[model samples]
Target chain A: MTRIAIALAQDFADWEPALLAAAARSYLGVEIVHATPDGMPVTSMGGLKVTPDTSYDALDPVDIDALVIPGGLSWEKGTAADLGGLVKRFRDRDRLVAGICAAASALGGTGVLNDVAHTGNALASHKAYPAYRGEAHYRDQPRAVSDGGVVTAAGSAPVSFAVEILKSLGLFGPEAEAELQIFAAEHR
Target chain B: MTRIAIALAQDFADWEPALLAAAARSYLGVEIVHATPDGMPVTSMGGLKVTPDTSYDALDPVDIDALVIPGGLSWEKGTAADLGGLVKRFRDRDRLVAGICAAASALGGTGVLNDVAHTGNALASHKAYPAYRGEAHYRDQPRAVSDGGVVTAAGSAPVSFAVEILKSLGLFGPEAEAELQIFAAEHR
Candidate 1:
């Protein structure tokens, strides 16, 4: 079965992965797994306590087809996990790697966004990291940006994040479009 | 401090409460809590294992300002908790009682929608409940419908759900509008 591992940090943003996880697992029959730095329980910014199934080190790209990261206070507070290694491992395996919101800053710290087009809450936040050199690749758009195997988005564009990630995994089609229509209906 | 309790069930829809929880708690400073039927941990439909802090019987309207129920597979499979009494308790206290997606059917079963304007995944699904006699009040709009102290929304309108709930709680001010604009930017 196709598997996707979501790397959650302390006080993870609750909304970031909601649509992606539900659409991929419940609708597309993908296996969604949660992983923390220590494979322990973490509380979300909204106070929802989630017990993850695996740890960051245990999430080998050989076992999981994709890795998703959601932004949170941890990233802003400088308390998030060191996911640079895991992000690189996925890229090395040519697997899909994605980050939304502040997690995009985490991805930038890994230096993988250097060669890929991406976007985050702000370019200055990513530039805070000395390793980040992709300011030119940054797209100042509201939706997610995907290039090669990397996907990045701002915190506000979760629906777009889910759509782009689904498309990256080759899961976006009629059903996905239909789901998007439901969300898009309100805006229309 | 204001507190809102989200009542979750087995296979609860993960995405339903994401925007509501994060926006309400993080932005509005409302205390977000999770409750289950038996006050135990429940897994979301997307494979997230969440440990709730309270139970159905423990959710008192005197203590909680609102009760939010998210749709899930359990509702479709007939394994959902009977929330009719809790919905009534919140209603009796004039507290906000909101349901989204399939959970709207559960609210319909409680007869609360009979007197208020509401919208759900479908009017037909609400009509499945014999107690749902307020078919006249049903609106077929895509966004969340809030009338009186009750809110109902389609499964696809989580952003709308968050915005309406914030407005109902008297929190949708300039800050909330700014947040909505952020999410709405993708569609624009």
Candidate 2:
């Protein structure tokens, strides 16, 4: 079974859950890891309060096939406290690292995207990173770029990014596609 | 000042905080209300956990400019006991009622969208609701469809939806838009 680990921070994008749901349906098992300890709730960019699973230190025991980082404004505060180092550990282990929106910038600061093609939230601040190979069409496209094991996508395309991550892991197939198609049709 | 209340349930989407943050930049205040007093931690679709504020029956001092309902799998479990009636009250008062993704279906079930246009998470069983006009196209796209005082949107587009809601309340303007643009540029 493919084990996907989603790193939850104090402030997250509201769309993170939908992305995870899409991934869970495509992958075998999806585990949510809290970037902080208990009792402290992290608010999303949308103002939803989230309680994380465990602190970053506790994440070592959980074996994971992939690591997904969702975007939020809390990166500056979290990174200042060495959250970037924690995310780097996942990449140091050579685990598949996926980042969406601002989370991409966080990964970029870790130097993992050096010479790697990646995309992120359509912010000009991200353009300053020389390590990130710019995907000019990232804002207009739902596509996720994979340069080696580093995966990144636009912030708004969480579902598309999650599907791409699942496909990369070989967990998504005709069955999952069919199910998603049905869902699309029903909503249409 | 417009005050928006988000009805929270078990397994409710944790994106409300992100939406609230965006709304805070756009409006006066965004409050979270719990639909149940069960005290159970609600897991988001992204695997994040959250706890709601107060309970359904505990919402005694109800003075809200709008009611926002977030989407989740719990909608499949059934209507939220008497919470459905409370949502109906908001509609009867002609206050703005917004639902995202599956939560839109929950609003549809409330009989508020009998002939009105709306949106929801277009990737689930709730997609079958004929009341939804169409799925929102982008995160920046306004998901809230306002017919008189009613507003609705596709799933997870809370940021845009809240912005529209605040604009309708006259609390949002160029200043808010400028701030949003700056934030979007920084985090997108």
How far is A64's C-alpha from truth in model 2 (Å)? 1.1
Instruction: Give the per-residue lDDT digits (tens) of candidate 1, residues A1-188.
Output: 78999998788888899888888888889999899999999988888899999899999998899999999898667677888789889999999999999899889999989999999999998998899999999999888999989999999988899999989988899997787656777876
lDDT values for all models: 0.88, 0.58
Worst 10 residues of 1 chain B by lDDT: B179-188
Ten-residue region with minimum lDDT total, candidate 2 chain B: B133-142
As for model 1, its CA RMSD to the true structure in angstroms is 1.2
Off by over 4 Å in 1: none
- TM-score (0 to 1) of chain B, per candidate? 0.96, 0.70
Candidate 1, residue B136: Cα displacement in angstroms equals: 0.7
User: What is the iRMS for every candidate structure?
Assistant: 1.1, 6.9
- Which prediction has the highest DockQ against the true structure? 1
In model 2, where do residues sit more than 4 Å from their true spots? A21-29, A37-40, A76-79, A122-124, A127-142, A175-188, B13-40, B60-62, B114-144, B153-164, B171-188
Residue A134 in model 1: shift from native, Å? 0.8
By summed lDDT, which 10 consecutive residues of candidate 1 chain A come out lowest? A179-188
State the TM-score for model 2.
Answer: 0.73
